[PDB]
Amino acid sequence: TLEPRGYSLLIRGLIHSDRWREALLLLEDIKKVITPSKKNYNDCIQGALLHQDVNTAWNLYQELLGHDIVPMLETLKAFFDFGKDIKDDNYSNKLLDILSYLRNNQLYPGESFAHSIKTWFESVPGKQWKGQFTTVRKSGQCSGCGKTIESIQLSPEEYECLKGKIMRDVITTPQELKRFENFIKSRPPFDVVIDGLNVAKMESQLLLNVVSQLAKRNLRLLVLGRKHMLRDEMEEVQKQASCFFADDIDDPFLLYATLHSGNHCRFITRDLMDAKTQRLFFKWQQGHQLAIVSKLTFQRILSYDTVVQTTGDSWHIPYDEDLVERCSCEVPTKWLCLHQK
Ligand SMILES: [Zn+2]
């Protein structure tokens, strides 16, 4: 089921003119038959902002969020761009809410968006915000202001919080569940949990390669697999690591085993995907997923959390560069550093 023919382009062609309200009418027509695209909302929101109708813009944005649409970064950028000319507590709170959105969803502005954020903070009267484009030292200290970036390490209470909430959703087969729980609970914590079949994407001979090199690092390995794999070179894996072979069904065992093992335990699988809990999951995933990148090497895992963050008197905002294509599984390396004087 589609939009009424050509409506997206009609909307886009209207929003700079005095007839921009007609674009909203068209949007209403679209809503009555399908969920509008993030571009549809982007266009109508910019139309509103272009004509100083800030309430209409924000209501559209909230409507979008309500449909669980992820806004275009270009849309978030528009609110900051128009914000440099707006002096009002309520508009500012909305912009700070967009920053919380980025923080909570582990998202990052593009380079010109970062410039727009910098420009906005530096435009806020009486607050003396200064922005700089920076990197972070190995220690966790911003190369700009000297502050230490939030630790990537969850506190024990945070970890118990996250681990607790995760379990209640895990509790496929009841028979396989209890068997796995018995397996795990009668064994010491592991150091790396390996999803055997998922890692074999870059066959069984690839699994041996991973296990055998990780074993030389004096790590306690747990390899997770399915019944079908053991039908030779798999026997060489079973002897170098602890293994659990579940039914050929997706299973939740990787999470359970890693979390049960504890805050120190890392894992290997494919790219993984209330605000406070989700925020903890992102932070835990960032600091615990071992990503593989001839001879095998893993992605660096930093000591600090690469995420939009604040101390009130400072913000640190990772951003993507135009000239740098970043894989989903690597964290940005460039930061916008904002500090009050
Ligand atoms: Zn800084």
What stretch of H or E contains 310? strand 309-310
Annotated binding site for Zn(2+): 142, 145, 316, 337
CB 136 within 8 A of CB 304: yes
83 CA from centroid of ligand 1 (Å): 23
Nearest in space to 229 (alpha carbons), one of 210, 243, 213: 243
The annotation places the binding site for Mg(2+) at 195, 250-251, 271
- Using the mean position of ligand 1's atoms as its centre, give its distance from the Cα of residue 194 in Å: 37
Whole-angstrom distance, CA of residue 333 vs CA of residue 283: 16
Element (H, E) at 47: helix 38-50
Strands 314-319 and 309-310: antiparallel
Question: How do 242-246 and 266-268 pair as beta strands?
Answer: unpaired
How many angstroms separate the alpha carbon of residue 264 from the centre of ligand 1? 28
Ligand 1 centre to CA of 335 (Å) is: 8
Strands (E) located in 126-172 = 129-134
Pairing of strands 129-134, 334-340: antiparallel
Query: How are beta strands 221-226 and 192-195 bridged, if at all?
Result: parallel
**Residue 250 belongs to a domain with what CATH number?**
3.40.50.11980
Q: Is 336 helix (H, G, I), strand (E, B) or coil?
A: strand
Q: How was this entry determined? A: X-ray
The CA distances from residue 72 to 178, 270, 305, in Å, are: 44, 25, 24
Q: Which residues pair with 242 in a beta bridge?
A: 222
Give the tokens for residue 243: 């293994």
Ligand 1: centre distance to CA 164 (Å)? 34
Q: Whole domain around residue 184: which residue ranges?
A: 156-298
120 Cα: distance to centroid of ligand 1 (angstroms): 17
What are φ and ψ of residue 187, in 5° steps? -130, 155
- In the numeric block, which tokens belong to residue 197? 């079949």
Between the CA of 188 and the centroid of ligand 1 the distance, in Å, is 41
User: Which secondary structure element, helix H or strand E, spans residue 120, and what is its range?
Assistant: helix 111-123
Q: Which amino acid is at 320?
A: D
Q: What is the distance between the alpha carbons of residues 187 and 172, in angstroms, rounded to a whole number?
A: 23
The three-state secondary structure class of 212 is helix
**Cβ atoms 184, 256 nearer than 8 A:** yes
- What DSSP string describes 225-273? EEGGGG---SHHHHHHSEEEEE------HHHHHHHHH-TT-EEE-SPP-
Backbone CA torsion sign across 224, 230, 233, 236 = positive
Q: Measuring CA to CA, which residue among 236, 257, 235 is closest to residue 246?
A: 257
Q: How far is the CA of 46 from the centre of ligand 1 (A)?
A: 31
Q: Ligand 1 centroid to 110 CA: how many Å?
A: 18
Rounded distance, CA 143 to CA 314, Å? 14
Cα–Cα distance for residue pair 30/4, rounded to 1 Å: 7
Q: In 10 A of CB 108, how many CB atoms?
A: 22
Q: What protein residues have CB closer than 5 angstroms to ion ligand 1?
A: 142, 144-145, 337
Contacts of 319 (CB under 8 A, 6+ apart): 108, 109, 110, 111, 113, 114, 332, 334, 335, 336
Radius of gyration of the chain (CA): 24
For tokens 């007609």, the residue is: 22
